[PDB]
Amino acid sequence: ENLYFQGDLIVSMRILGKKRTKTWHKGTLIAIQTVGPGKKYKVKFDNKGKSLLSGNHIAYDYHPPADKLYVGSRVVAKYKDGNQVWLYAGIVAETPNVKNKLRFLIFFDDGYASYVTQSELYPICRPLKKTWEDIEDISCRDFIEEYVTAYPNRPMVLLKSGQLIKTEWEGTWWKSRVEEVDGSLVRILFLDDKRCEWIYRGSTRLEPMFSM
Ligand SMILES: CCN(CC)CCNC(=O)c1cc(NC(=O)N2CC[C@H](N(CC)CC)C2)ccc1Cl
């Protein structure tokens, strides 16, 4: 059956859709198609392509009120590294409080983390009941299930700017320096290639966490 309405979705609404690159892109909802007890959502992307997508692979083109977002909420967020932006899927790890300077902490599906504002967050339209169950990487999937279900029980390691530690990359340990602390995140400089990454202080990418 072709529908025009399904829950709070309406054909012709602006939407975000997931592409095979795992990045999300602006489009229009052009059809809703019931297949058994299941629904599929046809997206015409603004730039290139049309996709028939499951409800967990579309996101609203508007920002969710903070009162609707919990630890474990399934979102698309802007990830910024200061020479590239992505719209990428993740999980809300913290909601705004005085300690995080009123920001949302996002754990992205690829294991990277960022603080973002509400204007950088888009709720996924039909998430799974267990929101982590559509994360591709088994390791990121298991870590999110543990973090979300055990929250607010959160082991983190305490680190100071200048501190010299081992940080993981591609399954080995690398010499690195703690540059900066910003709430539950630490900026690590890899001394080998002078590349910086923001890492969650509870991540076992940090050798002090991996052994704690
Ligand atoms: C949700 C966000 N997603 C969206 C997909 C992107 C996250 N970001 C990256 O994935 C990214 C990470 C690197 N990091 C490195 O290449 N390295 C770190 C140090 C390491 N070297 C090797 C000699 C020393 C140990 C190399 C580079 C570029 C990108 Cl874009």
Numbering used by the authors: 1 to 212
Task: Give the exact sentences the study uses for this entry.
Here we present a systematic approach to scale up the discovery and characterization of small molecule ligands for the WD40 repeat (WDR) protein family. We applied a DEL-ML hit-finding strategy to 16 WDRs with a range of druggability scores, and two non-WDRs with ligandable PPI domains as reference points. The SETDB1 TTD recognizes lysine methylation and acetylation marks on histone H3,60 and has several reported ligands.
Here we first tested 68 predicted ligands using an FP-based peptide displacement assay. In a displacement assay with FITC-labeled H3K9me2K14Ac, 20 compounds reduced the polarization signal by more than 60% indicating partial displacement. These potential ligands were then tested in dose–response by SPR, where six compounds had KD values ranging from 24 to 200 μM. The most potent hit is MR40983 (a racemate) with a KD value of 24 μM. Using these preliminary data, compounds were selected from Enamine REAL in an attempt to explore the SAR. Further, there appears to be a better fit to the (S)-enantiomer. MR46747 (the (S)-enantiomer of MR43625) binds with a KD value of 4 μM while the (R)-enantiomer of MR43625 binds with a KD value of 70 μM. Additional profiling shows that MR46747 displaces H3K9me2K14Ac with a Kdisp value of 36 μM, again demonstrating the discovery of a novel ligand that can displace a native peptide interaction partner.
